[PDB]
Write a protein that binds this ligand. Structure first.
Ligand SMILES: Nc1ncnc2c1ncn2[C@@H]1O[C@H](COP(=O)(O)OP(=O)(O)OP(=O)(O)O)[C@@H](O)[C@H]1O
Ligand SMILES: Nc1ncnc2c1ncn2[C@@H]1O[C@H](COP(=O)(O)OP(=O)(O)OP(=O)(O)O)[C@@H](O)[C@H]1O
Ligand SMILES: [Mg+2]
Ligand SMILES: [Mg+2]
Lengths: 298, 275, 258, 298
């Protein structure tokens, strides 16, 4: 019961950008928005913030209207291209932001240490790099007591260690009962830390739900990279006539695509004829799910 | 309210920018130059007759101060949008009008502290180094001059906010600010005078004295010249209305009313700004 | 060279923005104001005589055109650096000098086109509206065009000089008034006081040359010859030298911006 | 051959950002700069250009001083946080940059339609989104012949299909012998297109070479994953005592991590009793190499 969107349609000039986008989130649920580059990920987040007023739709933000600043009291947002005042000290910038949000001065230094920027604090934002500015934005997001935390493309600029640390932070905040709307373009690594997911192409919302239902309905086949299982053509002709797609690379490798829905028993036969030199089985990944659903819209 | 936080960050910008030094240093150079280096137009090099300095300095201020206020404030709203920090700030629990008033109070305190500092070097500069001035008249005259100058700074700040809320880009904001600056000083006087001289030989004699209220630059000049200052003979433009717009608090109320209507206009425009 | 690309870039910026309709119309409203409403002090009426409306027009031009220049090229350099776009441009095969020269040429063509359109509208208004007093305006108003344009260029170059050192656009304006303040107020007042201090011993042979050290004084000498120790040609060459040294200093400061 | 970073270091006012960097690349050599958030990757990337002057040493580019307009003519730069004049349309921006770069003025439209911004043209950069902005930056980067391209963090803000297309474009450019100094932090999937990868932390370039070469310089275990295959305890007791490092996860599965060499003979056990309800084989990828190098040497 965190955000309740009633079929919002938003128009920018004469160009519609959203049409009947009905979305919902639970109080403690984490929803991963994904979509095309020009779909509406950021604009939908901006509507959630209350920056723009939907022409056709009554959004409910934290069970209240988004115009009220009481919502923004316990709501945090991390903007993409998070640009900051370039002549304020990072410590000074974050202290000013806390003063705006009301958070205690004890929190600021501890939180700067928590993100991993205290070492390079006290130097102006201009000196920081694209990463440290992203980390300052992340520190802004975690500032205060955030009941509802809206992240926009948030791993942009961070390290794999920093990305996974943020992922654990998001999981912990889910444990604490906070609400997260995370939109990202690095689909790898977000399947574990995202409960519910939504995919939207153009304006219409393609689908919504947790990973399990979204995977099940698509029935997306599994991909198996292989290199020298038994021979160059031993494993090809046993599946070309078996009604299964299998393209045989010239370098003594066969790449078969199974369905992984009901033929789980056949997986035993898959690796049991001859000793294989190299096998690399990749299960149906949410990025492949994104590719499938984009192929559905168009 | 949270207004003080935004005013605090604006004051911090004032120190981290050469602005506070620049505004106060140049404004004090203005003040000191008119007293010692000034009056050399007649050949009498150095004297500090309080009626003269607070009138010549008053005119040089009615030109300088609006321009300084406009330069400070034109990019308060458009500058944040171009910087990319405006969209972030609105996400905070701050009203659009609340941040507008915060920026207004911040810039206003910048210019008020600046004028106080600059004349504070001036006020001592006369008192200590001059020969036999009646300190009381000096004090109340420069007091009226300080408060009038800071009030004119505030009204032109508010004009800068309204034009910035109207505009889309920094350079166009500067262009509109320059237009608003040029209009009041050089055109609201000239067109109004021309109005009497030819449009009005006997067309409507009674209306011209009061209209000088519309322009804050004229109100400021009348407030600082007329005063309690002796030998109060007003030349062209002011003499019509120097004699009687019936005031001594009416001009002050009108100037504050201009600041008020302009702040309401800025709140109105900035509310509808986005899209 | 190929600075022309940057020049058309700020030409498009000027046309897309509201300067051209606020700088040319700026002169249009005042010039007709000075020419018909400028004798309003004792008798409102028009085109008293060409050299009359030229004197007041030049006097207000000194006050305002420098100020326009300082308000057109303070954000020119530091503004791009704040926007983070300057560095990407510095990646291109242009170099430090060509960027500054191109922006200067573009902004100078902005001011020149504004002067032409506005004072030309005023001149055609003088011709049409008023009697055929004289038309061979051309020497007076054309010299006004050239002199005002060169003054705009020299203060534009000063604005580039100050901008290339400031690191925050807001601070750039503070050092923009200073340059405007020094030439408008400080120079004349301080020079007059120094003459008053030196009663008869200032060596008046070197006062006209000290007047050269202020572009505003040069511009006011130029439009005061309707019918001096300093030749008119030298009176132009000195303003040109001001422009040259200002641009040289701006290029020198810009090279060490980062 | 083309970019020779030999014996250089850089310091701001009192802080040494880059220490003893030696990087040598050649034509058609896809290099990568990987490192911690704030490790000097960008300052070195800028040092490739004339934006920064090397405090110590020299940085030869195309055999000439990088400050010469000639050197920048045969080069392309996509800067992280790409920022464009946000009042003139994308068509106008591409035309302008090509005019300073040198183009037929017809390559502009070809790139604009190629990058998928054809519909978005005329709309103006402010109305553009973070993605399309990054796409327009990439389109600018591909104006002319990019003898030496310098795409930095280029994948941020792009669709998974869009980043896949960008990687395919990197491959195509690598086919026609154009250098690319990649610096993207998105770790998964770059290594395939990376000819030579260089992981440099705050200290220095403590790692340089090809992914296969780096993989050799360091022994890395192979990754095996499962989710509820047979039981929770039987797998643990069977694999811990049989001379192997079995990571005993608590989600009803014992994901056993091999030495990366025993797996060739381990598969025989896996087919024996290990029914394949769920089996994932992932060779030690660039994530593992990055963690190894960063933690052990940093
Ligand atoms: N002009 C500057 N003055 C002072 N310090 C600077 C300046 N530019 C960068 N730095 C600092 O130098 C260090 C190295 O920056 P670096 O090149 O690693 O940025 P980066 O590679 O973009 O970081 P990342 O890619 O991980 O986001 C950082 O501490 C950064 O804040
Ligand atoms: N202020 C605006 N005026 C007009 N159109 C706008 C505006 N802001 C956004 N748009 C439109 O919204 C779309 C881009 O915003 P959107 O939310 O789709 O970005 P996004 O999907 O987050 O992009 P990315 O994920 O690549 O950062 C385009 O149709 C764009 O023209
Ligand atoms: Mg976005
Ligand atoms: Mg970087």
């Amino acid at each position: 019961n965190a955000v309740e969107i009633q079929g919002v349609s938003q128009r920018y000039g004469s160009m519609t950008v959203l049409h009947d986008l009905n979305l919902n989130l639970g109080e403690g649920e984490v929803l991963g928005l994904f979509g095309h580059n020009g779909a509406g990920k950021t604009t939908s987040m901006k509507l959630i913030l209350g920056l723009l007023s939907p022409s056709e739709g009554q959004v409910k933000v934290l069970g209240r209207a988004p115009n009220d600043p009481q919502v923004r009291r316990q709501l945090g947002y991390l903007p993409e291209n998070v640009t900051f005042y370039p002549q304020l000290s990072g410590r000074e910038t974050l202290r000013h932001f806390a003063r705006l949000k009301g958070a205690a001065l004890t929190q600021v230094d501890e939180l700067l240490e928590q993100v991993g920027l205290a070492h390079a604090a006290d130097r102006r934002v201009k000196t920081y790099s694209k990463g440290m500015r992203q980390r300052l934005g992340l520190a802004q997001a975690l500032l205060g007591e955030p009941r509802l935390l809206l992240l926009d493309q948030p791993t942009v600029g961070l390290d794999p260690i920093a990305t996974q640390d943020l992922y654990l932070l998001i999981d912990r905040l889910r444990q604490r009962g906070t609400s997260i709307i995370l939109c990202s373009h690095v689909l790898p690594g977000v399947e574990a830390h995202i409960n519910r997911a939504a995919i939207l192409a153009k304006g219409c919302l393609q689908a919504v739900g947790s990973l399990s239902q979204l995977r099940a309905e698509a029935g997306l086949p599994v991909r198996i990279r292989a290199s020298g299982i038994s021979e160059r053509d031993s494993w090809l002709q046993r599946w070309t006539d078996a009604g299964h797609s299998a393209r045989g690379l010239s370098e003594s490798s066969i790449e078969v695509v199974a369905v992984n829905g009901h033929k789980l028993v056949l997986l035993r036969q898959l690796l049991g004829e001859g000793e294989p030199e190299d096998i690399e089985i990749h299960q149906p990944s949410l990025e492949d799910l994104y590719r499938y659903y984009m192929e559905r819209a168009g | 309210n949270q207004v003080w936080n935004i005013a605090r960050k604006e004051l911090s910008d004032g120190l981290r920018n050469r602005w506070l030094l620049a505004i106060s240093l140049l404004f004090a150079v203005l003040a000191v130059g008119i007293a010692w280096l000034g009056a050399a137009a007649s050949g009498q090099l150095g004297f500090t007759s309080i009626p003269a300095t607070i009138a010549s300095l008053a005119s040089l201020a009615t030109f300088l101060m609006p321009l300084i206020a406009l330069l400070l404030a034109y990019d308060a709203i458009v500058g944040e949008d171009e910087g990319g920090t405006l969209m972030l700030l609105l996400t905070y629990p701050l009203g659009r009008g609340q941040i507008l008033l915060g920026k207004f109070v911040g810039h206003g305190l910048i210019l008020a502290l600046a004028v106080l500092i600059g004349f504070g070097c001036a006020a001592l500069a006369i008192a200590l180094l001059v020969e036999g001035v009646e300190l009381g008249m000096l004090f109340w005259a420069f007091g009226r001059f300080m408060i009038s100058s800071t009030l004119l700074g505030w009204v032109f700040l508010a004009f800068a906010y309204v034009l910035s809320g109207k505009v889309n880009e920094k350079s166009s904001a500067a262009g509109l600010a320059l237009g608003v600056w040029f209009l009041f000083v050089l055109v609201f006087d000239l067109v109004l005078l021309a109005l009497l001289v030819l449009s009005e030989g006997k067309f409507n004699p009674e209306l011209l004295p009061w209209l000088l209220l519309l322009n804050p630059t004229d109100i400021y000049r009348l407030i600082n010249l007329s005063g309690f200052e002796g030998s109060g003979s007003a030349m062209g433009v002011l003499s019509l209305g120097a004699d009687l717009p019936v005031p001594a608090a009416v001009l002050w109320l009108c100037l504050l009313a201009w600041i008020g209507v302009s702040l309401l206009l800025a709140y109105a425009i900035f509310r509808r700004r986005l899209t």
